[PDB]
């Protein structure tokens, strides 16, 4: 509903709420009614006498610009404009469509530690297969190569002059001295160059169990011209079999200077590696994002679970189980590419907190998400349109500004222009000035007055004293103090005072409402600005909150177990907190401590189901209501008792959703006395 | 705010690495390491002892050994003030052996003079972090056992003990345990906390305790984000200064968010056998990605003067690696405040500062003013952020006369008088003399602040506002200024109101180096005083009333803290004699309660703490009576004592004397909610055969597992009833209670006779064999402290005696023993419904 803080001009009604509306007809206000009545919820305006052509919300709206000649537009509209309103979100439908024929640039960055010897043996004869598999998706592909080991300093590698020459543990074998990063091959469409340049690489080794490849990826991002990236799809395969060093590890080597992310390549070697630490994971993640490079973490089975956590930090990255000899590189790359292209993340660039950009996603295969922080969809087919309902809420009447929406991993962007629709376009200015006593001017049906006059019709001059007959009308009843003692009558309306105490606004028609008198939660009125606002004894909540002081949420409920039932079916939950019956405990009621084992009294049930005995006088199905037998073992309480035949029935009783219902699994190897 | 930067003292040195590590030393000396300054062949790292008086630094004449060290000396430092000790370690001693160059640590312990010192599992880097215990230095090896970690605790230069975790499937490899270390005091007994910033890839921090001589790891916590590097720095904080540690701070400088970098978390000490868990997280400013917030941690003691320990946290990555430092206050609830109190930025100090805040040290006074000083490290610079004394201002406005005379206001030469008193006080204790602290204060007085056309003006300005400035000492100072009313007032409904708001500027202390006082950030900067008009409710007489208050916890027997969470009291207020103006009722109640709502008059209320409720402002009619339900919220973890003393008294603008009925107090019993569950267990011998040919001795056991699922540690008295004899024949021989958890308790036995003599017919009626068919013994075990969330297996064991077996109609008999948990009902109670499980029984069935 339209809650109004003493509004007195058309645009103030829009600032004062998302559902509020203004009406322009002159008949809408009588002598005893304040101009604030112009602002209320739309049906009440219709009931009072407003009309569909006399009303002006104004609704937040969008304009979409598109190119007719542009075929297979991967991200449309090209640019949009929003006449945003505070609180009332605008919506517009950005459409995504997967295109064909977009080439691929593949850079292969590999660990050269001693455990990667066989992987390096297999990779050096893989360039042609990788390039052809790139061509099997889209034509005109390119490949590259890159290598890392670790920083050339203790503890990470021993600095003895003999061991620096030959760091690999097998002394007999011939191996290259340690290095941080070496750029090996330029991005080319020739397989011969790949099989030539890579073949000159030799194995190496460090001392520590992690490796430095985070700073190699940081250099592969920092050196665009040397690597050879086009403005096309860029892939970065990262092949490791163990963990990585990251920022902070350099203190053991007396290194404390941060990695700066600039291109420090000299003669294809990352010289000056020891004067910089390792980068943080956030450095790599952020820098790859601002260059449209998509990491493919080819990691071994033991490291998969560790590397999955990077994807929460790095969108447009994929992790795949790499074999112990990197035999499945091509299949892993293809699967990662399919996952990357089907998983279309659609996210904006950073924007002021005054904008609450929100996405509704109508994905393709029947799934739909609501109020997600970023657009989410999966299984995006080729040439199958997808729709994202971008919901943009302002709360400010923002100054005209702009942000960019982008489909992550793609250069295509949507420019969004945003403008304050808070101004009013009332046509009443054409009316004669006689209505404003010849002093003010009439717009939206209210006689707006200059600095020299005040009042509903500019009847009261700012220099003249207030008439007693006008002051006497600012009372609810004979017992009410003038303006409730918290204001003054100015031309028949209470000009409210302000309170030196923090946050105490005084408002309402007779200056009788204070925003601090509602009942408190955690010592704050309505829980503070973060939960709701006070209207002289009544609390209005933001969406997602309810109750007398907005202390009770209506969303992201903690009542719900992962099976989507309230308190596991054995308790109501008032105000997001489950309330239980009997000896059940918070929060999800999953287990009951203290209640004795009921196994001894369900023997009457287990005696029938698993053994298929006939009725016990009373029918078996009615003898054991609310229970099911499982064909597979189940987890929970274990029990053993004696049956009617004197045999040991060893069974388990897993509790499930609802009240007094379980699953029973009984051992078939019956033993009897 | 408190830490000074306008006149910050600075040390410069062209030494490579100068400012990497700083520790304060007793007096006015600071030891600064330069872990990269080369001074000789194969020698890098030297100590620089810096003095406030000399304004410079000279190297400590240390006799470094000749074993091709490259110690990187000064990378780690430690010190204590009583006795005077200081520890310097070189983590990286490059021992170039025949095949490999190992890295070990070498350690220097100094006394009062920095002249000569002792110097006394490869790859260990023994002195990566250092601490001085009450028996010697504590050295941390980040690289022991394949970079798993560990520490060496030294009692003497010849004897030491290694401390680390138990090894489980190489999960602790590369963890770097000992990358940070700290000492926690438990009843003045030394205990250890260690950090592993690389654990797996998420991080880990653990506590080590001296449980019966040996060092064991009892609790540990883990980090969330990969690469956040959780555990880089540790800081044990004793917030309350009682002599026991309260919190451990765990820094994760590389936590990554879209607009933030780095976080620190608060982990209060676990109580009893409870699991250790975090409860808060701290963050730097937004828009400062890669700020490395939480790289440096230190204890500054009490900075603002409130007896609660405060922490400073380094953020050297902010503003393009020019860095910042964050000050966090400790809170009275044994916590740390979620938001920083001060940020010091290297930009505002000097353009030359890089990596500002990479090192911190605090705990001692170096300026000899009596205030703790913080020393901060930077690349080639060291600064002394001296803590400035905190000044609070108490303003007393006393209108004379106390109320506006009737003839002065009733319908422009009319006048009044107000006395304003500004009193400046120190929140901290220090060595500054009287008269040294000078402050310049400017304040504004506003008559009818918040209203247009104010009803009163000042005499010396002839308008409703006055600004005044003066230089004030640390003592009571007063000045009196007259007031005027420019008009008559025909609506005397609300007083004249005076507002005072001020800003304080502290003059620099010339003797101590231009140190300035600072006004407290939480000090009340706005003061309001009411100048009420005279009333006329009578034959021109002065107003008076007989206001009284009574209230009762009606239909309420005892207050249960654990539930329900809300209780409300029927407060009634009665007035007699004459009308009362602006009646306010103040409720004084323990800190653990809070105020929610007031219901049924224009009745509105605002919040030993206090709560003032406005009973129908401005007036409360003749002979009126009002009843309302002041609703309070009781904390779940509250501790109100044995009884809670609510105290409320009423006041009015008439300022009548404190009659005996104007104050009411009524203590109600406090009865802490506990929830204890006792149950049998499956291992109990629930069934046996029948044996009647000859008597036998067979052992059987009933385990009445006891748990505490509430949030109160309580003393319990636990009782078993065990059959011992039936028909003059023993069923049990010697029932021996046993506890497997070794908790301290004592047990005894008592025997009592059966309640019924009809054992020949009760068996015919039912096959139950308990203390109503047989003689039973009573084993009572007293436990003085049963803690929170702890369980023990109270078990009974003894040999059954088949000397009484009765061949009744039922082919089975039941030996029943019942265990019920008695507790002092005067203080403790069970919750309704769920409290039926305080007792349990176990039956041993005997049949074919
Ligand atoms: C903690 O320290 C103990 C020794 O104080 C370590 O125990 C040794 O572990 C190695 C691992 O291969 C064995 O070879 C030794 O035989 C063990 N020694 C003893 C006396 O048991 C233990 O590994 C360390 N654990 C961690 C996590 O660092
Ligand atoms: C976007 O499309 C969906 C159907 O996919 C439709 O329900 C919705 O109304 C559209 N958005 C707008 C703003 O019309
Ligand atoms: C010691 O440090 C010097 C200075 O950098 C260096 O030249 C020398 O090789 C180092 N010696 C060892 C054994 O690390
Ligand atoms: C008192 O407050 C007013 C308004 O906030 C401000 O303009 C004035 O400067 C303050 N007085 C002082 C002495 O700072
Ligand atoms: C007072 O407490 C009772 C019992 O909790 C509750 O039902 C009632 O709503 C509360 N408030 C009033 C005004 O009675
Ligand atoms: C106050 O609460 C009690 C119970 O807590 C209730 O019986 C009584 O009616 C309440 N008083 C009012 C005025 O609602
Ligand atoms: C009311 O109680 C408070 C509690 O400290 C006391 O200070 C005060 O003197 C009492 N009387 C009045 C009239 O406030
Ligand atoms: C003993 O057993 C009888 C029969 O089950 C029961 O009624 C009684 O409560 C039990 N306890 C005592 C103390 O008699
Ligand atoms: C009690 O004994 C059982 C079986 O020996 C065991 O599973 C249980 O953990 C024990 N209780 C406690 C608190 O350890
Ligand atoms: C009980 O039986 C055990 C084993 O059968 C035996 O060792 C013990 O001496 C017997 N008596 C007592 C009092 O425990
Ligand atoms: Ca391999
Ligand atoms: Ca303490
Ligand atoms: Ca403090
Ligand atoms: Ca000082």
Numbering used by the authors:
A (entry chain B): 2 to 674
B (entry chain A): 1 to 120, 332 to 622, 629 to 817, 827 to 833, 843 to 1083
What does the paper say about this structure?
The Bordetella adenylate cyclase toxin (ACT) uses the αMβ2 integrin as a receptor, but the structural basis for integrin binding and neutralization by antibodies is poorly understood. Adenylate cyclase toxin (ACT) from Bordetella pertussis, the causative agent of whooping cough, is a member of the pore-forming RTX toxin family. ACT uses the αMβ2 integrin as a receptor, with binding required for efficient intoxication of macrophage J774A.1 cells as well as Chinese hamster ovary (CHO) cells recombinantly expressing integrin.
Subsequent 3D classification and heterogeneous refinement allowed us to separate the particles for the ternary complex from those of the unbound αMβ2, yielding final particle sets of 347,508 particles for the ternary complex and 1,114,670 particles for unbound αMβ2. Consistent with these observations, the integrin tailpiece in the cryo-EM reconstruction of unbound αMβ2 was poorly resolved. Comparison of unbound αMβ2 with RTX751-bound αMβ2 showed that the binding of the RTX domain stabilizes a conformation of αMβ2 that is partially extended relative to the unbound αMβ2. The bound and unbound αMβ2 are related by a hinge motion of the headpiece relative to the tailpiece. The position of the RTX751 L1 helix between the αMβ2 headpiece and tailpiece would result in a steric clash with αM in the unbound conformation, meaning the L1 helix may also contribute to the stabilization of the partially extended state. Cryo-EM maps of unbound αMβ2 have been deposited in the EMDB and assigned codes EMD-26739 (composite map), EMD-27125 (global refinement map), and EMD-27126 (tailpiece local refinement map).
